[PDB]
């Protein structure tokens, strides 16, 4: 049984309804921006067209689509490093999936898969990216 | 409501910079006790201790995550109340039109005094007349001279004061067990390593608990200029 | 997956409720063929009023086949 | 379909962790938004781009909890769990779950009438309509008077 | 054009074949000047005026129901002679219409 | 639009009287309960039945119209809003490039013709023995 | 405080306050006229003196026109309901309010001052060209006053429509009648300060518009451009009145409301179109005058709606009330008399009838039966409505028949003679005449004296 | 609005009443005069007291 509860919006100006507990707890969840990541999949029109703006962007996303990566766009910035551990990151989120999904109802134990590969998860929470934005050319050339 | 202005930045989160730096009192400060930037700053810190515990999650019960996220469970008495807190503030910029009231179903006027300024314009169609102005007072169940339509004055008032979010939240909501600060030294950790902070709340809540400053890089960020 | 690029898309309708907003059979969304027909005559009357300034002043003296009183002696 | 598409508040995210738009002045620094798509990547293209929120997989078995104790919940955090959960799809969720205040007559304090009163009501409902019958009449009499 | 409620006969036929009309008196009272006490200090002679406004009164029927101090505009509603801050809580205009929504009902 | 409205206009505050058409009808609809079946004389009137929040269409409309005002990316809209919006600066650039384009050339040629015979090269001649230019708008002589 | 208050039923009470003021200067202008006019001869201004006669008569005219009568229906009256009509905590504009009453007042110091220190010399109160250019300073003091009146007028105008934007109930036929007047201000103010602005060209910058080959008829169009207008917006407000009191005394539901406000609107639109009926005389195009005459006349429909749905306000009223109340009795009587003011002036309205009665004393009269009595009357009427209201005591008038009568008897013994000396013909803006004109003008004097008396029974 | 202009307040009480020194209540000025004449006329008129009420109101000589 799940109760009823009051989620009010606003600092000044508070405007309560009811809501969904869990619906709640979700929606607190996505806003740990550290922790819940969106990422982003790629498809062939959208990659060439990304050539238009950023040829880099647009080699990394190429090497994310033929992989088929859900990927941070930070993290595809270093995509040429992090492909290993990109690539095992897909295999453990797909068997944790998988598991969880195909588990019965009201089993709620927690799947078994390499934390140490996925991030952010306390086993990894994530390396210290350096800036991109520094040039690198001489203009006189 | 239509009536209100937009958002502020504040009306979604609070910068971290107002939250109290005597954390260890904070978290066993009773609910009647606290002012608003403490509310505030009690519930994100709990709440967001246990959900950033994923593993404690799924034996949680709803009652017991309901409480830590700081949301009331509701009951009729409070879905009574704040209902009529919303209908009122609807009312403060919008027009008032509903059934025709009976001594069965009088119109229903919310107020907060003891008076407010009515108008009765009949019924539907070829029922409805003139603007008839009169003062609504409590305790009186009063009759349009026109059309016989019943009125009634309904008082946002409980205990020497009137119905607001927080007056609903004080009077129903029970605070559970005191919070346990191991919880929050123990998801620090978790999300918090090797100068990486995945939990910035619980990092500067830790570094308040320690005394302020003690964590690497907490006495760079509290040091400002003007 | 497919998508649409947001630019090309097309507007988006009103909303059908008890309080429908519909200019569709107004009329006024843009000129219509009359009002350039109006343009037209501007420019006609403009230039045959230089062209022609004995217009105005014409000659009674008719002869009209048919007489006066035919379809083709009143234009 | 407010404001131009542009929304009032939004998120700016960037890569220098000692960066400040107020204070620095340099001019190679690129921001991102709240999904990371760095600022030279138009909208039109980025909105395209499909973005799911990726929880960490400690979190399924609490969102497989939420569907089976609420069925009408579980496809979208099947969909959560999954990585196939857009921003619009939260906002669907979200609204789908929301309910409004509800207010109980049975709870209003009534003005005080005695028993003696109470069973007067038919009475002075009676009266009303006999004053309304007298006045529509009254009307076409003096209306033909004065006129 | 209005010309009164419309009534129906089976509303005009009465439960008691002694029910006549109600003679209950709708003038309020005898009037005059208000009177203050010259022992009532300023704040003791605003409460006095408080008291004796007209547009707080009221005649209650025989079931227990008042029918009040009405006027046709907003001007005789507020205090005589008028505040400074009249109108603190809105003035409620009450439409009247047909439609109704569900959740208002209970089964 | 330059000129703001509160009914189409509203850029001060962004309310929108219906919500988006994207939203299914089950998880938002505009609020028009006008169509509502008659109520069973069996069931008893529980809220106050005035119009308002207790309305959950009329509820999910105010609580979206504080919502929507943070999103994560922009809501592109169509070339078409786009050439709307700035309408009035488009033609006034267009209007400048005909008075220099268009405007600039005929009005010297006017002017060097003028030096030579006097008047205008739109203008009659005159026979009166009076000296000067005279008129420009030979129409409104 | 005093001076910084923005409580808008404190300013209201503030311009009610200052037209009774400048009201007494007002009253005792009329006074020296009508003594004055008493026979012929020198009575109270010496022959060497006469220019002072010329100033009594403008200022006189300006004064109640702009700085009493206008003051007093649209800003005394409106601004002390008008917020509590449209069931509004208080006024759109709080500091604009303050500040339009304080503009009053300095323009009114203004005004006075030029009377002491400047030269006393009159052009009347329609400032025609070029005598009103070849005056003294005084001319150009009463021209300052204006414009700053002016100035207080829109924006107090711009006020008003604002209520619009706020209003939380029903737009009554009180508020349609002062939105209206507030559209007739922002439309013919802006078009009065041009030609002003002229006059002041001619008089203090060299300016040529009013010296040969420059049409001094333009003043006219300009000004009487304003003038009509003004005329309106200062009785509908009075229509406004009288409206709410027929209903509130009557226990009546106002009869035709829509039609009473579209009447309103009517008014306005045609007002605006008619000016010219002031310039008949000048030599005007006969198609011009046909026009002008054509729609002057058909102002008499929408006003002659609006006089019509006010008696059956009162038709069938219950006897048991007591209907010798001071306001009820004013509010008819504006009935009875404006209807005598609006005849006279259908009656000039036909331009070979205005031949004979331009610049005559009927026209004085005509305006006197609408402004001097009709107008005064719907403010008192207005504010012995509101008295509870607005607190005010010290004075016997709420039930006194006896004022009633005396004003309405003597009041008409002043202007009915005015009617009569038109077809005689005695000229206006004038203080000596023939001889034979003596016992009309003596029995109009005597009115004058008389009504005098009865203002200090008041107290 | 959190902390913004009461829609409603209570009056607060009134201040302490003052007796002179032998307990007489001290009077304040009264603008409500008992002018003397021998003239004790009383004058009721029915007036109007909104839409469906009136008032008896008197005007009394003194
Ligand atoms: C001789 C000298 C003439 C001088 C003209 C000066 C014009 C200055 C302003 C120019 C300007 O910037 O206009 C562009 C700009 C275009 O507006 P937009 O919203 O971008 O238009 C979008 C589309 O055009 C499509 O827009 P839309 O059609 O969807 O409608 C939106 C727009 C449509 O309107 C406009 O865009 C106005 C354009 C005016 C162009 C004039 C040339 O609405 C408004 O902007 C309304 C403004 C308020 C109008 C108030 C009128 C008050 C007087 C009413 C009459 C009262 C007396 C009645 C007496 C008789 C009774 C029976 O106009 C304005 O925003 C200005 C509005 C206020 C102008 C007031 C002028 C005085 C009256
Ligand atoms: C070498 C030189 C180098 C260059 C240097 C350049 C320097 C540049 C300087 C630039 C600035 C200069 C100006 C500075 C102004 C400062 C304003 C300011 O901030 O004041 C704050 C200041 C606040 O004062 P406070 O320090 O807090 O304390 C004030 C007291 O406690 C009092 O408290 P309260 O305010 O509550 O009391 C006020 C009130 C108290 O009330 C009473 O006195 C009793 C109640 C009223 C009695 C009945 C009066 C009649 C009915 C009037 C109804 C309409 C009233 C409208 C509202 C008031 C308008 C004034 O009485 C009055 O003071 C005036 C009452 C009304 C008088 C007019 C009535 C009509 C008479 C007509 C007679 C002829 C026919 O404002 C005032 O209270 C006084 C303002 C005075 C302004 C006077 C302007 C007069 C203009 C007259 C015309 C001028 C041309 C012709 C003159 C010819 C003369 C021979
Ligand atoms: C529009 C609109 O949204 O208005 C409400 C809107 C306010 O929104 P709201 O919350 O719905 O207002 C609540 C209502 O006020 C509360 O109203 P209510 O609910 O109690 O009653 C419903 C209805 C009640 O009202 C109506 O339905 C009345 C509609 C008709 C008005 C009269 C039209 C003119 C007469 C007919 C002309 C026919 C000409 C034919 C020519 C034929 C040629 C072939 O409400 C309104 O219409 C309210 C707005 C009234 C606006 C009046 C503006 C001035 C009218 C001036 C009339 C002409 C004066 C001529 C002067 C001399 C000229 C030479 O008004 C404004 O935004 C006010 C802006 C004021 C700007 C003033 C400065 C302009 C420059
Ligand atoms: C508020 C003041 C006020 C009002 C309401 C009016 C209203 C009217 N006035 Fe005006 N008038 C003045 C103030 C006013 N006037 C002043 C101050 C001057 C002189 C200024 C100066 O020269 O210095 C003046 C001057 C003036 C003249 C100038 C005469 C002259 O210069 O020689 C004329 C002539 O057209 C005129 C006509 C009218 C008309 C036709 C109306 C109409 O509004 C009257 C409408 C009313 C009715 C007609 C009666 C009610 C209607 C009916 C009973 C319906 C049945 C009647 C008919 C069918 C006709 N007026
Ligand atoms: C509304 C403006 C108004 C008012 C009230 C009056 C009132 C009076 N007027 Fe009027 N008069 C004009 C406006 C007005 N007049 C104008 C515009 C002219 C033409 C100017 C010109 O020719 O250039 C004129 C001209 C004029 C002349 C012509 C002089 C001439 O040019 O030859 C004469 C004398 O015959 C005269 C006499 C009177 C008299 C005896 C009264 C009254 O005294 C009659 C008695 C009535 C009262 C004494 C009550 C008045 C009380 C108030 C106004 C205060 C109201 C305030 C509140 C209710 C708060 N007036
Ligand atoms: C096979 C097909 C080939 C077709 C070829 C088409 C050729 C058409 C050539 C058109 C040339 C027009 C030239 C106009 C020159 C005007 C110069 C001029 O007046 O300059 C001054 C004048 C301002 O003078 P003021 O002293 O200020 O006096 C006026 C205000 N008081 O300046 C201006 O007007 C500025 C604008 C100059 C516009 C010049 C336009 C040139 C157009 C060239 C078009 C070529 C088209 C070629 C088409 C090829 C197709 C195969
Ligand atoms: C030789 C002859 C020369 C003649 C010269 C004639 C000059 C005429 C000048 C007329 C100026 C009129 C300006 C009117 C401005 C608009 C008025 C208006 O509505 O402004 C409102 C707005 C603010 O509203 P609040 O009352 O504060 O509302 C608070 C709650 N929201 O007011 C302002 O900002 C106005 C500021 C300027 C003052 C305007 C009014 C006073 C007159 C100023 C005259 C200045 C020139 C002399
Ligand atoms: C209110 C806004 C609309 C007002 C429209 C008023 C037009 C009235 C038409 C009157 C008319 O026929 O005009 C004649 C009349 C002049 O007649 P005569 O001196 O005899 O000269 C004729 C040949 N020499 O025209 C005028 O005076 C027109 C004055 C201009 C009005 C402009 C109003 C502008 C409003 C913005
Ligand atoms: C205050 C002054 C304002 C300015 C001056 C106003 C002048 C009068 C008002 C004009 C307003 C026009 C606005 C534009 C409307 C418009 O384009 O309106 C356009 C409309 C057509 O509408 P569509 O765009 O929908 O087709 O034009 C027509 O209805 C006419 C169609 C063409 C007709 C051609 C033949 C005409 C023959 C005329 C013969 C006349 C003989 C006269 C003998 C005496
Ligand atoms: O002026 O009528
Ligand atoms: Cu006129
Ligand atoms: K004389
Ligand atoms: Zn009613």
Redesign the pocket.
Same mark, same amino acid.
């Given at each position: 049984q799940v109760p009823d509860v009051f989620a009010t919006f606003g600092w000044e100006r508070r405007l309560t309804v009811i809501h969904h507990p869990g619906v709640m707890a979700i929606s607190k969840l996505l806003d740990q921006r550290t922790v819940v990541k969106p990422r982003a999949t790629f498809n062939q029109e959208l990659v060439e067209e990304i050539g238009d703006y950023d040829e880099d962007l647009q080699r990394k996303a190429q090497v994310a689509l033929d992989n088929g990566l859900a990927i941070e766009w930070r993290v595809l910035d270093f995509i040429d490093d992090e492909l290993p551990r990109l690539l095992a990151e897909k295999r453990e989120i797909e068997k944790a999936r998988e598991q969880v999904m195909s588990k019965a109802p009201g089993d709620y134990t927690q799947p078994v898969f390499d934390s140490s590969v996925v991030v952010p998860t306390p086993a990894n929470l994530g390396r210290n990216y350096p800036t991109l934005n520094l040039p690198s050319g001489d203009p006189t050339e | 409501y239509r009536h209100w202005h937009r958002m502020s930045e504040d009306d979604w989160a609070l910068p971290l910079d107002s939250m109290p730096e005597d954390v260890k009192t904070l978290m066993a400060t009773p609910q009647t006790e606290r002012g608003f930037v403490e509310d505030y700053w009690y519930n994100r810190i709990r709440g967001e201790a246990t959900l950033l515990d994923p593993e404690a999650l799924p034996s949680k019960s709803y009652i017991a995550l309901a409480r830590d996220m700081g949301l009331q469970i509701v009951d009729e008495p409070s879905s009574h109340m704040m209902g009529l807190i919303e209908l009122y503030e609807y009312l403060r910029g919008a027009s008032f039109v509903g059934p025709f009231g009976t001594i069965e179903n009088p119109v229903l006027v919310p107020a907060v005094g003891q008076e407010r300024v009515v108008a009765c314009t009949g019924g539907v169609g070829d029922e409805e007349h003139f603007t008839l102005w009169f003062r609504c007072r409590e305790g009186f169940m009063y009759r349009c001279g026109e059309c016989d339509q019943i009125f009634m004055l309904v008082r946002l008032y409980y205990e020497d004061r009137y119905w607001t979010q927080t007056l609903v939240r004080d009077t129903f909501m029970s605070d559970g067990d005191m919070f346990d600060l191991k919880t929050l030294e123990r998801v620090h950790k978790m999300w918090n390593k090797d100068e990486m902070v995945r939990w910035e709340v619980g990092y500067w809540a830790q570094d308040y608990v320690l005394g302020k400053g003690v964590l690497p890089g907490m006495v760079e960020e509290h040091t400002r200029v003007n | 997956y497919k998508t649409e690029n947001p630019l090309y898309k097309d507007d988006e309708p009103f909303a059908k409720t008890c309080h429908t907003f519909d200019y569709t059979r107004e009329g006024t969304e843009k000129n219509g063929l009359g009002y350039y027909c109006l343009m037209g005559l501007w420019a006609s009357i403009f230039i045959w009023d230089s062209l022609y300034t004995g217009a105005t002043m014409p000659t009674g003296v008719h002869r009209y086949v048919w007489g006066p009183y035919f379809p083709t002696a009143w234009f | 379909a407010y404001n131009g598409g542009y929304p009032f508040h939004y998120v700016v995210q960037y890569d220098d962790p000692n960066y400040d738009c107020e204070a620095d002045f340099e001019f190679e620094e690129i921001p991102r938004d709240e999904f990371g798509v760095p600022a030279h990547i138009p909208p039109e293209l980025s909105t395209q781009i499909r973005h799911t929120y990726y929880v960490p997989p400690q979190y399924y078995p609490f969102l497989k909890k939420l569907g089976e104790d609420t069925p009408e919940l579980k496809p979208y955090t099947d969909k959560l769990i999954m990585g196939d959960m857009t921003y619009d799809d939260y906002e669907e969720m979200f609204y789908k779950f929301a309910k409004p205040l509800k207010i109980y007559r049975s709870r209003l304090p009534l003005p005080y009438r005695t028993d003696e009163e109470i069973s007067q009501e038919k009475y002075v409902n009676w009266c009303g309509r006999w004053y309304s019958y007298r006045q529509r009449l009254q009307g076409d009499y003096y209306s033909r008077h004065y006129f | 054009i209005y010309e009164g409620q419309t009534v129906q006969e089976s509303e005009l036929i009465p439960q008691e074949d002694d029910w006549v009309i109600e003679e209950t008196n709708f003038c309020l009272g005898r009037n005059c000047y208000v009177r203050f006490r010259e022992e009532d200090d300023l704040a003791r002679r605003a409460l006095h005026q408080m008291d004796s406004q007209l547009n707080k009164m009221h005649t209650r029927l025989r079931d227990g129901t008042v029918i009040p101090y009405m006027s046709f505009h907003p001007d005789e509603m507020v205090d005589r002679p008028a505040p400074i801050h009249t109108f603190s809580e809105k003035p409620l205009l009450k439409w009247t219409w047909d439609e109704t929504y569900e959740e208002a009902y209970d089964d | 639009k330059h000129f703001f409205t509160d009914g189409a206009n509203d850029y001060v505050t962004g309310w929108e009287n219906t919500p988006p058409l994207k939203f299914p009808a089950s998880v938002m609809k505009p609020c028009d309960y006008s169509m509502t079946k008659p109520i069973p004389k069996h069931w008893k009137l529980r809220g106050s039945g005035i119009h308002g929040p207790e309305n959950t269409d009329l509820m999910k409309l105010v609580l979206w119209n504080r919502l929507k005002q943070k999103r994560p990316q922009r809501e592109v809209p169509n070339i078409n809003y786009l050439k709307d919006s700035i309408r009035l600066e488009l033609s006034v650039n267009w209007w400048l490039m005909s008075c220099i384009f268009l405007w600039g050339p005929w009005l010297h040629w006017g002017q060097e013709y003028q030096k030579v015979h006097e008047q205008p090269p739109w203008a009659m001649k005159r026979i009166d023995g009076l000296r000067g230019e005279g008129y420009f708008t030979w129409f409104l002589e | 405080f005093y001076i910084l208050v923005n409580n808008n039923k404190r300013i209201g009470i503030y311009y009610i306050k200052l037209s009774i003021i400048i009201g007494i200067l007002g009253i005792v202008l009329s006074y020296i006229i009508r003594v004055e006019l008493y026979n012929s001869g020198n009575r109270i201004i010496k022959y060497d003196n006469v220019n002072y006669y010329n100033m009594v008569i403008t200022l006189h005219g300006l004064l109640m026109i702009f700085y009493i009568i206008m003051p007093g229906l649209y800003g005394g009256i409106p601004l002390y309901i008008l917020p509590i009509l449209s069931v509004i905590t208080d006024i759109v504009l709080p500091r604009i309010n303050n500040i339009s009453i304080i503009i009053v007042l300095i323009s009114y110091i203004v005004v006075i001052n030029s009377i002491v220190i400047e030269y006393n010399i009159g052009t009347g109160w329609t400032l025609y060209p070029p005598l009103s250019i070849i005056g003294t300073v005084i001319v150009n003091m009463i021209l300052y006053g204006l414009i700053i009146i002016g100035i207080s007028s829109i924006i107090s105008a711009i006020n008003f429509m604002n209520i619009l934007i706020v209003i939380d109930g029903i737009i009554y036929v009180y508020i349609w009648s002062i939105i209206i007047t507030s559209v007739l201000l922002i =439309?013919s103010l802006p +078009?009065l300060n041009g030609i002003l602005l002229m006059i002041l060209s001619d008089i203090y910058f060299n300016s040529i518009y009013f010296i040969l080959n420059g049409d001094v008829?333009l003043y006219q169009?300009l000004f009487w451009?304003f003038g009509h207008p003004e005329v309106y917006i200062l009785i509908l407000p009075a229509f406004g009145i009288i409206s709410i009191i027929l209903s509130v005394l009557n226990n009546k539901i106002i009869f035709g409301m829509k039609s009473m406000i579209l009447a309103i609107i009517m008014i306005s =639109?045609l007002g605006? +179109?008619v000016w010219?009926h002031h310039i008949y005389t000048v030599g005007?195009?006969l198609?011009?005058k046909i026009?002008?005459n054509n729609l002057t006349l058909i102002i008499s429909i929408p006003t002659g709606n609006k006089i019509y749905n006010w008696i059956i306000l009162y038709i069938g009223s219950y006897n048991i009330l007591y209907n010798g109340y001071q306001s009820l009795i004013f509010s008819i009587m504006f009935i009875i008399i404006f209807i005598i003011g609006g005849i006279t002036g259908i009656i000039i309205s036909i331009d070979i009838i205005d031949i004979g009665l331009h610049d005559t004393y009927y026209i004085v009269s005509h305006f006197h039966y609408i402004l001097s009595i009709g107008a005064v009357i719907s403010l008192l009427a207005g504010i012995l409505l509101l008295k509870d209201i607005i607190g005010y005591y010290n004075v016997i008038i709420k039930i006194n028949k006896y004022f009633g009568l005396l004003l309405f008897i003597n009041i008409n013994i002043i202007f009915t003679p005015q009617f009569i000396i038109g077809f005689n013909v005695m000229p206006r803006r004038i203080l000596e005449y023939s001889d034979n004109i003596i016992v009309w003008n003596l029995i109009s004097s005597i009115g004058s004296i008389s009504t005098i008396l009865i203002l200090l029974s008041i107290f | 609005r959190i902390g913004g202009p009461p829609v409603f307040m209570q009056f607060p009480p009134p201040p302490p009443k003052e007796y002179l020194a032998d307990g007489t209540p001290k009077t304040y000025p009264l603008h409500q005069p008992v002018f003397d004449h021998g003239y004790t006329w009383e004058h009721w008129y029915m007036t109007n007291a909104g839409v469906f009420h009136t008032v008896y109101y008197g005007e009394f000589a003194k």
């Open positions: - | - | - | - | - | - | =439309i +078009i008829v169009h451009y =639109i605006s +179109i010219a005007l195009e198609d011009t026009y002008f | -």
